[PDB]
Paper text:
To confirm the binding mode of cAMP to the converted binding site, mutant 6 of TbPKAR(199-499) carrying the triple replacements in site A was expressed in E. coli and co-crystallized with cAMP. A molecule of cAMP was bound to site A and an inosine molecule (captured during expression in E. coli) to the unmodified site B. Structural similarity of mutant 6 to wild type TbPKAR was very high (Cα RMSD = 0.430 Å). The E311A and V319A replacements created additional space inside the pocket to accommodate the bulky phosphate group of cAMP. An altered conformer of cysteine 278 and slight displacement of the loop between β–2 and β–3 in site-A allowed R318 to be accommodated so that it can interact with an exocyclic oxygen of cAMP. Of particular note is Cys278 in TbPKAR mutant 6, which is significantly displaced to the newly inserted R318. Simultaneous binding of cAMP and inosine to mutant 6 was supported by nanoDSF analysis. The refolded protein (APO form) had a low Tm measured by nanoDSF, but Tm raised by 14 °C upon addition of cAMP and by 28 °C upon addition of both cAMP and inosine. cAMP also stabilized the refolded mutant 6 protein during purification. Mutant 6 with site A converted to cyclic nucleotide specificity (E311A, T318R, V319A) was blocked by excess of cAMP during refolding and was used to measure nucleoside binding to the non-mutated site B.
Cyclic nucleotide binding domains (CNB) confer allosteric regulation by cAMP or cGMP to many signaling proteins, including PKA and PKG. Here, we show that natural nucleosides inosine, guanosine and adenosine are nanomolar affinity CNB ligands and activators of PKA orthologs of the important tropical pathogens Trypanosoma brucei, Trypanosoma cruzi, and Leishmania. Substitution of two to three amino acids in the binding sites is sufficient for conversion of CNB domains from nucleoside to cyclic nucleotide specificity.
Numbering used by the authors: 216 to 489
Write the structure that this text describes.
């Protein structure tokens, strides 16, 4: 991990800046610092495809690159059926580079053009991958039991795991602080928490108690406002958190469920804050 020298491929400073924006939202790069992000972007090169081009084909064994889509879209096709639609900013060909397997599916361009940014297997495995498989596999056992994640398919739960990181809190620790910017959605894996808002007069007000499998922090993501309450650990608590920049990338399919949840009777407090 230390002595690996990535290739550098010629590109303009505009292309590098465009790449960095992509790496910012795609979860494969969630935990890279500035320098490794700069080096990963140096190690990438632009490719182009036409409609119906197969960027890769199920069962192939030369698998020495993944791609990050800048523009256009691609179908993911297993056993002849389209199973998944890959859109701008997402990755294709990452599974074979992570698990050293043949391509799990055909990837076929379904827009007139597709522009994507390619990355070789060695630079990914060495600079990017890190503990992604250990991280995926530690979280997935929990994730399949989180109720609001039921609308994420299996591929999407493992993708969310690429962007999660965990924390331990002690009784009385502030996980979320009232009036500050919401930056993390927390999934509770062990313990209990209190939601503490304020009334009109500004007094502390107990709102709700949440536990294992619950989620907090997403209200400020949905409707772009300051934290409406504290969230305080009642017990020794353990959480996985998702950064705001990965919110839509990872939770797109259950966003409508989070909005439904925010109109339930236990968000009456939050309801009257507008
Ligand atoms: N269920 C799936 N959902 C979304 N994308 C998939 C799925 N299966 C395969 N793919 C994508 O298709 C790619 C085909 O090659 P890879 O297996 O290297 O990496 C794969 C993923 O990028
Ligand atoms: O009325 C509420 N009911 C239930 N949970 C709430 C309510 N208001 C806020 N939170 C929780 O506390 C976080 C900090 O603002 C919110 O993002 C939400 O998860």
């Amino acid at each position: 991990a230390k002595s690996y020298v990535a290739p550098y491929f010629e590109k303009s400073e505009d292309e590098t800046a465009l790449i960095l924006k992509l790496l910012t939202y795609n979860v494969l790069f969630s935990f890279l610092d500035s320098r490794d992000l700069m080096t990963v972007a140096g190690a990438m090169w632009r490719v182009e495809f036409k409609q119906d081009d197969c960027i890769m084909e199920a069962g192939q064994t030369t698998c020495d690159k993944l791609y990050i889509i800048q523009d256009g879209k691609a179908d993911i096709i297993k056993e002849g059926q389209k199973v998944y639609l890959k859109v701008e900013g997402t990755a294709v060909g990452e599974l074979a580079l992570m698990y050293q397997t043949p391509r799990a599916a055909t990837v076929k361009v379904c827009t007139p053009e597709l522009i994507a940014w390619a990355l070789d297997r060695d630079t990914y495995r060495h600079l990017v991958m890190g503990s992604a498989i250990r991280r995926r596999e530690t979280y997935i056992q929990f994730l399949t039991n989180i109720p609001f994640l039921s609308g994420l398919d299996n591929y999407e739960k493992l993708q969310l795991a690429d962007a999660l990181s965990s924390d331990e809190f002690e009784p009385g620790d502030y996980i979320i602080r009232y009036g500050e910017e919401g930056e993390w959605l927390y999934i509770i894996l062990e313990g209990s928490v209190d939601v503490v808002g304020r009334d009109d007069d500004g007094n502390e007000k107990h709102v709700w108690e949440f536990g294992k499998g619950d989620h907090v922090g997403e209200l400020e993501f949905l409707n772009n406002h300051a934290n409406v309450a504290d969230v305080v650990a009642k017990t020794h608590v353990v959480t996985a958190k998702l950064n705001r920049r990965h919110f839509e990338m990872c939770l797109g399919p259950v966003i409508d469920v989070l909005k439904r949840t925010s109109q339930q009777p236990n968000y009456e407090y939050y309801q009257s804050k507008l």
